């Protein structure tokens, strides 16, 4: 069936429609309505419903005025997606992605679902941008709107990352984060895809605490499961697995720890580093790298948990004294011994204080 | 001798100079030139007639700086010029059509000072010159300004092979941006890949691609060359 | 002014505004002495028939020949994004980390 395979790959590659069964079955998809009501519905009608919702969201926030200028404009009723060159489909996917990053906080609200339902029912973001749309509804993977997404979602235009949702598309029930986290352990393609999203919304200052807590949760239980996989006890295998783990996780934490203007994902990366020094027996030079970057990515708002991470990292480090920059910024900590006593009521602080005072002997 | 073959059989020879006593390590054809590099001299033939043109002699300071261990190389848009890497840290810029040393560039980090391997970039006017103490330095060579600096080699095991990818993708933790480097070492059989975009992170290593050079074993592992097959994954 | 605000109201409502929808969518160290003395005629060779500007241009210096051949090396391969600090980032870009 060689020609059947090549034509099948053309058909699953095909982003357009050429019979009337597929205009009706393609225009039938909707978040709000039913299929029978959504088939016989022009685009001025859907623009009225939605753009009522986008008037509401433009009252509720303020960064939606350029998307009034482009995406929810009065002229965007007549923009067919499939008659657009790839520079135009690329730029339109840029504005679609930036709008969806912007919306993703308020997504339990019906004005947000109305605006997203205009993006689906005209621009077919469920057919052209499924990674970003699954990435934005995927924090809210327990609300029923995620299951309406899982009923309008095309089964074979979904990234291999997100293909764990196939029995949840098949039987219309929302998936648990046991399943999300389990395939986040086995596939590093998935765990990077979440962290490629969350860091992309924070360079433009569009974060929200469900995104921060959701991402930090998946990195927490996921890196736990990864360390439990990567243990073997064979020396060269656990060395090679420690290097592979640092190469997977490494750059995500390396921006997240320094991202001072988002103290949330700064604290979540503190959290994953604390898990990583705690359960994962990483080498002393790696732990000095975590301590020095923790020391550099430092805020008044993230003082108090960052000190706890210094106690964890210094406590599981095998060498005795600290290194330089750590001692300098801990000098710049205002209430040192009192804060370390409050930490020592619940943790162990003594190797951190020993590395400090020994480094002060060596200054 | 320098024989010249086609279809499996010999179609030419090439006239070596009389004053030559050294084994000859770098054959390099570009422009209208065939250029070979022996050990401390470079003999250059005109390729349109197979006829010997000149012999380029590098400078000498301490009888080791004249040695030519990085080889020689060509840039794409640089006209009649050849870039040599010495046993000092120097890489010299030679107009091979007229013989002159036109420019010389000095290593960064003067503790690391023997050019072990050098390669052009897919960008214009940039090189990956590769020192025995460990650094890969990748440079403008008409601004003479460093673009990146990396610490790829061990002092016990420097980079001896370095090869960029000209596919156009491969980097950015999903794979959509170019800037994928490959390096290897004569001491190990493990090749190391570098994402090259922000500061050039490492991204992985093929461990025992070929066998390692094993002390007290009879097998003969190690590596000799890396090449990205150009324009391809 | 030739186009009043009322006239642009009617042009937006009646006719269509894909033009404005599109417009809103779209928002040295050394010097060689040889390249004064390396003149090349471009329409000799077939592979150099296609980096001249107009049809009637041959006499091209080594400088101008270098510029055209740079523009074609960019034409076959545009300039990469990487070619245009932190302790853990330096730890990742350092190969002393990854040992055996």
């Amino acid at each position: 069936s060689s020609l059947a395979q090549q034509l099948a790959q053309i058909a699953a590659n095909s982003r357009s429609s050429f019979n009337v069964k597929a205009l009706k079955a393609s225009h039938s998809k909707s978040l709000i309505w039913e299929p029978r009501v959504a088939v016989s519905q022009t685009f001025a009608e859907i623009y009225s419903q939605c753009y009522e919702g986008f008037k509401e969201l433009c009252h509720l926030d303020s960064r939606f005025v350029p998307f009034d200028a482009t995406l929810f404009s009065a002229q965007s009723q007549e923009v067919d997606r499939t008659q657009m060159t790839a520079e135009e489909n690329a730029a339109l996917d840029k504005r679609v992605d930036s709008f969806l990053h912007l919306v993703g906080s308020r997504l339990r609200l019906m004005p947000a679902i109305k605006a997203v339902e205009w993006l689906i029912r005209r621009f077919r973001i469920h057919e052209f941008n499924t990674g970003t749309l699954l990435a934005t509804f995927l924090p809210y993977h327990t609300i029923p709107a995620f299951v309406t997404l899982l009923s309008i979602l095309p089964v074979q235009r979904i990234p291999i990352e997100y293909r764990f949702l196939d029995p949840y598309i098949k039987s219309l029930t929302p998936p648990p984060r046991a399943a999300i986290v389990q395939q986040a352990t086995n596939r590093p393609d998935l765990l990077s895809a979440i962290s490629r999203y969350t860091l992309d919304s924070c360079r433009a200052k569009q974060e929200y605490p469900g995104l921060i807590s959701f991402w930090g949760g998946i990195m927490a239980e996921a890196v736990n499961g990864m360390i439990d996989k990567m243990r073997s006890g064979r020396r060269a295998i656990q060395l090679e697995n420690d290097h592979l783990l640092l190469q997977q996780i490494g750059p995500v934490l390396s921006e997240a720890m320094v991202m001072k203007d988002v103290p949330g994902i700064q604290i979540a990366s503190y959290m994953v580093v604390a898990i990583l020094a705690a359960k994962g027996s990483l080498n002393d030079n790696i732990l000095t790298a975590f301590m020095e970057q923790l020391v550099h990515g430092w805020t008044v708002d993230t003082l108090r948990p960052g000190l706890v991470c210094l106690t964890m990292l210094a406590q599981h480090r095998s060498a005795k004294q600290l290194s330089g920059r750590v001692a300098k910024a801990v000098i710049k900590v205002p209430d040192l011994v009192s804060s370390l006593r409050d930490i020592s009521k619940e943790h162990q602080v003594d190797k951190l204080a020993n590395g400090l005072v020994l480094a002060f002997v060596d200054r | 001798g320098l024989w010249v073959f086609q279809r499996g059989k010999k179609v030419a020879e090439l006239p070596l100079p009389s004053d030559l006593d050294q084994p000859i390590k770098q054959i390099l054809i570009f422009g209208g030139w065939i250029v070979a590099c022996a050990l401390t001299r470079i003999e250059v033939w005109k390729a349109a007639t197979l006829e010997h043109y000149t012999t380029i002699f590098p400078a000498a300071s301490k009888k080791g700086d004249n040695e030519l261990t990085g080889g020689a190389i060509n840039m794409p848009t640089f006209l009649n010029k050849i870039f040599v890497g010495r046993k000092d840290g120097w890489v010299e810029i030679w107009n091979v059509s007229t013989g002159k040393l036109i420019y010389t560039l000095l290593p960064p980090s003067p503790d690391c000072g023997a050019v072990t391997c050098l390669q052009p970039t897919p960008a214009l006017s940039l090189l990956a010159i590769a020192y025995s103490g460990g650094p890969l330095v990748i440079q403008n060579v008409l601004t003479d300004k460093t673009v990146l600096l990396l610490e790829a080699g061990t002092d016990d095991a420097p980079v001896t092979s370095i090869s960029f990818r000209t596919d156009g993708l491969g980097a950015g933790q999903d794979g959509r941006k170019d800037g994928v480097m490959a390096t290897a070492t004569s001491v190990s059989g493990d090749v190391t890949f570098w994402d090259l975009n922000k500061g050039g992170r490492i991204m992985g290593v093929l461990r025992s691609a070929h066998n390692p050079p094993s002390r007290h074993n009879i097998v003969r592992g190690g590596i000799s060359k890396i090449e990205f097959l150009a324009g391809q994954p | 002014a030739e186009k009043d605000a009322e006239e642009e109201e009617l042009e937006k409502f009646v006719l269509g505004a894909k033009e404005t929808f599109r417009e809103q969518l779209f928002r040295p160290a050394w010097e060689d002495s040889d390249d004064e003395r390396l003149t090349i005629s471009l329409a000799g060779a077939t592979r150099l028939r296609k980096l001249r500007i107009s049809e009637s241009e041959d006499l091209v210096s080594g400088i101008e020949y270098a510029r055209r051949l740079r523009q074609q090396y960019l034409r076959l391969y545009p300039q990469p994004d990487w070619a245009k600090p932190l302790p853990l980032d330096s730890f990742l870009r350092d190969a002393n980390s990854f040992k055996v």
Binding site: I160, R163 | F30, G31, G32, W33, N74, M75, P76, T77, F78, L79, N80, S97, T166, D167, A230, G231, Q232, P233 | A45, R47, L48, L69, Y73, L76, Y77
Partner: peptide
Amino acid sequence: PVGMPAKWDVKEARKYNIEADG
């Protein structure tokens, strides 16, 4: 199954030849 490798065919490439540098 999703993500299995395709068969290797040689990818074409308009590469740059260097005999015009002289």
